[PDB]
Write a protein that binds this ligand. Structure first.
Ligand code: SF4
Ligand code: SF4
Ligand code: FCO
Ligand code: F3S
Ligand SMILES: [Mg+2]
Ligand code: NI
Lengths: 263, 544
């Protein structure tokens, strides 16, 4: 036959490719199945065959597709000096992202950087990095975390193609994945309630897997699904004895630091 | 006969796709050969600026976000860094765990590099459709180890999937590929293309497993969360059931390394032997990795099982020790303020100053790291030469074998083909060492589970963290003042390999490696990609 698959354009701005990497850890479905049977991934610098002008041209073909497209943005937008501190093909990233956004059926921000500005926006923000919605002035579906769980990202993508925009919180996050506090689903909750905290990482308390609140854990103020779905089908930070950094909250680099404290 | 056109003039490839981060490459070409080159990194973030005045404990979490592909390695280098500054010696178990996580990272990172970033430069995916899948099964049955993935039936099913995908008219990531309609510089038989493509798809599944393995110890991937000042937080990682799962997953990954990666690599290398004479450089640096003693930077350099060393002028008879005081970064040809040349990283300065695109005087967001005035190639090829030169038994055996299967001299390794082969060579070696390293930690962990040492924050101090990351010699350098970050500088493998010219106008490794690159087709200059990709560039790592 030939069932047409929805066009996805994926842009990389000021990013670390961690979001791309996280996406490709999907197992429901695997990334191959997703790009062969579910979507048409039509621009993606990390893995696309074309380079240079050939790549640029594939982008512009995708943008002018008769059937429209969805936009996935990974990374914040550096806006200083006319946005020249972040360029692709000799164009400021703000300018290309603006142009791709104008006509997108929907915009999905993958990761804290695109959603809210991320690691480059942290004080003193030398590149004047913004999040997409702020830089462009358009509503974005935010899939944050640094990086987000592929389950959250693929789920959102599938959800937007087959049902519509999902219910979002005040921060633009799908309530399906971000509706609950890390802390409310943490196996160490009973330790927290009984005020059983590890005072250091070397302590016997740490060995006994006591709560990590006193070591800076931001679980109590972070919205994400980590302890419920885990990462890589095996683990999550607190299971590995490490406090949550609050990496799915906007501007967490500045609001959650110092990471090993609560002050 | 290496294909080469008569093209004279400039070529710009921007974006360089299939790398990490944002790279523009400019060449001058004459009679179809690259005669000059510029490596122009196109993004600045400024992590070093961001860290000034912050909690030294916080650095590992910021710096890990220099990059999501070489995830971990920055958090590891920061932790080593701060551990050094505070003068704490991490427990045995911590050394073991940190080193095993690095091993898992090499496996994951290298596998994805060859198949998902590098292979499309050498493999014509569309030409796979022309193979007979029976003849391709016979070909795979005759080179590579026996496996069900390699049967006519499995190869046919790959071919059928690809066929319906191309016939759909939506080529997705293959849109405008340099191989579409054939290309003089692509030499592989259709059967080889089909085998490699099957393995490309398999690899997409296998890298999930590699990351799972890594996560058992790292807590998650990407961006691990198990390292702390004084050691590691993951007591569970020292336990039996997680370690048995870690081993089991690691052996599956390594089976795929031995069954698919290495044989595909060697087939590719066999067909493109001419690439053993293109893309060579002369100086190699490594800080070493997988040390038996990580109590200090000096001990790391001395006892790294993948040894440290410096090779100059391809001289494999004189491996020098690494002089950490001899490292400095220039900025003359970079987008930084005047007066920042020659800085040792402890005195490093990150004062960004953009000019304009393709300003030959300032054309990269990367600094130019130099070692006594010399550019240095880092990474698997550097590690391989240094290890081979010191008679490291695994490197000598595997390298001499690769040389024996390919029928080329060791000097053919100073090349893009060599650079590519090295990457697979050390992957098979990490794989051969996994069971031993896991047993060492399982045994130690069961005897005593100490994983983090006590430490005190000093008012004032400096420290350096060294690691040999998948792309090469990585160093993080801190000055603490008032118990805070006074200066924090990253010098990263891609900075070494892909930075611009130094203060003397001297080309970096990649810029030199590109000189004499043949261009069969100026419209579709895959050869540029072959060599750049061979360095496994990460601009986000490079510029931070
Ligand atoms: S959100 Fe985190 S993992 Fe994703 S691009 Fe930004 S720094 Fe990288
Ligand atoms: S470890 Fe963190 S998320 Fe878990 S109970 Fe304690 S404070 Fe909450
Ligand atoms: N490996 C890796 Fe990333 C780079 N370059 C780092 O450090
Ligand atoms: S740091 Fe991030 S990944 Fe989950 S456990 Fe905390 S939100
Ligand atoms: Mg630096
Ligand atoms: Ni990197």
């Amino acid at each position: 036959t030939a069932k047409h698959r929805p066009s996805v354009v994926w842009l990389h701005n000021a990013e670390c490719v961690g979001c791309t990497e996280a996406a490709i850890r999907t197992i429901k479905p695997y990334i191959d199945a997703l790009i062969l049977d579910t979507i048409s991934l039509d621009y993606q610098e990390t893995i696309m065959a074309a380079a240079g002008e050939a790549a640029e041209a594939a982008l512009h073909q995708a943008l002018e597709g008769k059937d429209g497209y969805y936009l996935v943005v990974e990374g914040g937008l550096p806006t200083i000096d006319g946005g020249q501190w972040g360029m692709v093909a000799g164009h400021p990233m703000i300018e290309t992202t603006k142009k791709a956004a104008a006509k997108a059926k929907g915009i999905i921000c993958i990761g804290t950087c695109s959603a809210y500005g991320g690691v480059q926006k942290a004080k003193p923000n030398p590149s004047q990095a913004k999040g997409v919605s702020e830089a462009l002035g358009v509503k974005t579906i935010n899939i944050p975390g640094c990086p987000p769980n592929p389950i959250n990202f693929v789920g959102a993508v599938v959800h937007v193609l087959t049902k519509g925009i999902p219910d979002l919180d005040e921060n633009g996050r799908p309530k399906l994945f971000y509706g609950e506090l890390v802390h409310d689903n943490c196996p160490r909750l009973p330790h927290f309630e009984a005020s059983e905290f590890a005072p250091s990482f070397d302590s016997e308390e740490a060995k006994k897997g006591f709560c990590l609140y006193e070591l800076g854990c931001k679980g109590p103020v972070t919205y994400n699904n980590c302890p419920k779905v885990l990462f890589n089908q095996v683990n999550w930070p607190v299971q590995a004895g490490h406090p949550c950094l609050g990496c799915s909250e906007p501007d967490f680099w500045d609001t959650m630091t110092p990471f090993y404290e609560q002050g | 006969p290496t294909p080469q056109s008569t093209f004279t003039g400039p070529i710009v490839v921007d974006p360089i796709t299939r790398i990490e981060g944002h790279l523009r490459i400019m060449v001058e070409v004459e009679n179809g050969k690259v005669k000059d080159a510029w490596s122009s990194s196109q993004l600045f973030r400024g992590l070093e600026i961001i860290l000034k005045g912050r909690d030294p404990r916080d650095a590992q979490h910021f710096t890990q976000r220099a990059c999501g592909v070489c995830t971990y390695v920055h958090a590891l280098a920061s932790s080593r860094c701060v551990d050094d500054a505070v003068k704490v010696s991490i427990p045995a178990n911590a050394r073991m765990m940190r080193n095993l996580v690095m091993a898992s990272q090499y496996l994951h990172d290298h596998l994805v590099h060859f198949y998902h970033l590098h292979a499309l430069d050498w493999v014509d995916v569309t030409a796979a459709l022309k193979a007979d899948p029976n003849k391709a099964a016979k070909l795979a049955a005759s080179i590579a180890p026996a496996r069900p993935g390699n049967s006519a039936k499995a190869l046919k099913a790959v071919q059928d999937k690809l066929k319906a995908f191309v016939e759909s008219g939506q080529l997705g990531i293959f849109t405008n590929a340099y191989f579409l309609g054939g290309h003089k510089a692509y030499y592989l038989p259709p059967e080889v293309d089909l085998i490699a493509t099957a393995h490309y798809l398999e690899a997409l599944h296998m890298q999930v497993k590699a990351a799972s393995a890594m996560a058992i110890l790292g807590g998650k991937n990407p961006h691990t969360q198990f390292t702390v000042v004084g050691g590691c937080s993951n007591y569970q990682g020292l336990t039996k059931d997680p370690l048995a799962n870690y081993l089991a997953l690691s052996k599956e990954v390594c089976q795929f390394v031995n069954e698919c990666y290495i044989p595909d690599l060697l087939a590719v290398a066999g067909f493109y032997k001419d690439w053993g004479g293109i893309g060579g450089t002369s100086n190699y640096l490594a800080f070493g990795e997988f040390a038996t003693d990580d109590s200090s930077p000096e001990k790391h350099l001395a006892t790294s099982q993948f040894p440290s060393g410096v090779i100059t002028g391809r001289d494999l008879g004189k491996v020098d020790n690494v002089d950490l005081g001899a490292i400095y970064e220039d900025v003359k040809y970079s987008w930084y303020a005047p007066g920042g040349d020659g800085k040792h990283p402890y005195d490093g300065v990150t004062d960004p100053k953009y000019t304009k695109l393709d300003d030959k005087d300032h054309y990269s967001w990367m600094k130019a790291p130099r070692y006594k005035g010399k550019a240095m190639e880092v990474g698997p090829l550097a590690r391989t030469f240094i290890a081979y030169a010191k008679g490291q038994p695994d490197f000598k055996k595997v390298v001499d074998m690769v040389l024996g299967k390919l029928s080329v001299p060791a000097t053919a390794l100073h090349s893009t083909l060599g650079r590519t082969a090295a990457r697979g060579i050390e992957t098979a070696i990490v794989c051969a060492n996994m069971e031993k390293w896991i047993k060492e930690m399982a045994d130690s962990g069961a005897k005593d589970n100490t994983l983090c040492a006590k430490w005190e924050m000093p008012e004032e101090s400096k420290g350096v963290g060294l690691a040999d990351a998948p792309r090469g010699a990585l160093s993080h350098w801190i000055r603490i003042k008032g118990k805070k970050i006074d200066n924090f500088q990253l010098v990263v493998p891609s900075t070494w390999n892909l930075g611009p010219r130094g203060a003397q106008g001297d080309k970096s490794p990649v810029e030199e490696a590109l000189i004499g690159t043949p261009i069969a087709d100026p419209k579709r200059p895959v050869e540029i990609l072959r060599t750049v990709h061979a360095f496994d560039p990460c601009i986000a790592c490079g510029v931070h």
